[PDB]
Amino acid sequence: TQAEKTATDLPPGFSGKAGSANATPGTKGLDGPTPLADGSFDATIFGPAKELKSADDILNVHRRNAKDPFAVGAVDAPLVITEFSDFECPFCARWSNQTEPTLMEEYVSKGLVRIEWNDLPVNGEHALAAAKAGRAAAAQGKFDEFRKALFEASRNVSGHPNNTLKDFERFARNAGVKDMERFSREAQDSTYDEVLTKAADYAHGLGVSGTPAFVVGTQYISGAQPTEEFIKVIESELKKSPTFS
Ligand SMILES: [Cl-]
């Protein structure tokens, strides 16, 4: 009785960060995307790592492409979150503003989670124009900063902000986009039209129809569910698969 034993294992509802605690952090690609030869980034990246043919192929949604300027976190993180999102969507804004920072702090910054953005424009012309602007920011390595500036500007909006070019230019300046002539041209011209069509067709082929939508490891989540739900799923998925080889 004059001894201390190690903590008992508890049911997961009382176990706190057990998946995290036992997972192997990634060590590669923590410093951002790999640039192209000219120091710009491949803003035409979209899609899965490999075709999905059945439910058995669910992990294929996660690209783990070191060149991807739409991704944050270790390319060898044990868990990937694949997100399908729309820049006019208030549920997408709420996830970005209220859930993502917690996931950055608890998981991404520790090498445990990589988050990959995928365009799924549902809100019409403003959403397509915003996605084109996002790809123009990503070409200059500023996707994350652009996304945060735009969604923080939507933090009090219950509907759609109806952003247009001058809004996107402000978010790009806020984000530190260095070549504003290239940004403004690519935000408007045909550069990203093909890839946005292909991204939408890819999401529709998975049956993903509503934003935001997520594949957290092997688990699909529809909508801006509570932060605690994302944490529980992350912990569960890290328990199932603690290491990426
Ligand atoms: Cl596919």
Residue numbers in the entry: 38 to 282
What does the primary publication say about this deposited structure?
To reveal the structural basis for the potential thiol-disulfide oxidoreductase activity of TsdA, we determined the C. diphtheriae wild-type TsdA structure by X-ray crystallography refracted to 1.45 Å atomic resolution with R-work and R-free factors equal to 11.4 and 15.3 %, respectively. The structure is a single continuous amino acid chain covering 38 to 282 residues of the protein (full length MW of 31 kDa). Despite using a recombinant protein lacking its transmembrane domain (1–32) for crystallization, four N-terminal and seven C-terminal residues are not visible in the structure, most likely due to flexibility of these fragments. The thioredoxin-like domain (residues 54 to 160 and 230 to 282) consists of a five-strand β-sheet in an order of β1↑- β3↓- β2↓- β4↑- β5↓ and six flanking helices (one 310-helix, ƞ1, and five α-helices, α2-4 and α9-10). The thioredoxin-like domain is separated by the amino acid segment 161 to 229 of the α-helical domain. The conserved catalytic CPFC motif, residues 126 to 129, forms the active site together with a conserved cis-Pro loop (residues T248 and P249). The C126 residue is located at the N-terminal end of the kinked α-helix 126 to 136; such a location of the CXXC motif is characteristic of DsbA proteins. The cysteine sulfurs in the CXXC motif are 3.40 Å apart with clear separation of corresponding electron densities; thus, the structure represents a reduced form of the protein. In addition, the α-helical domain of TsdA is comprised of four α-helices. Of note, no additional cysteine residue is found in TsdA.
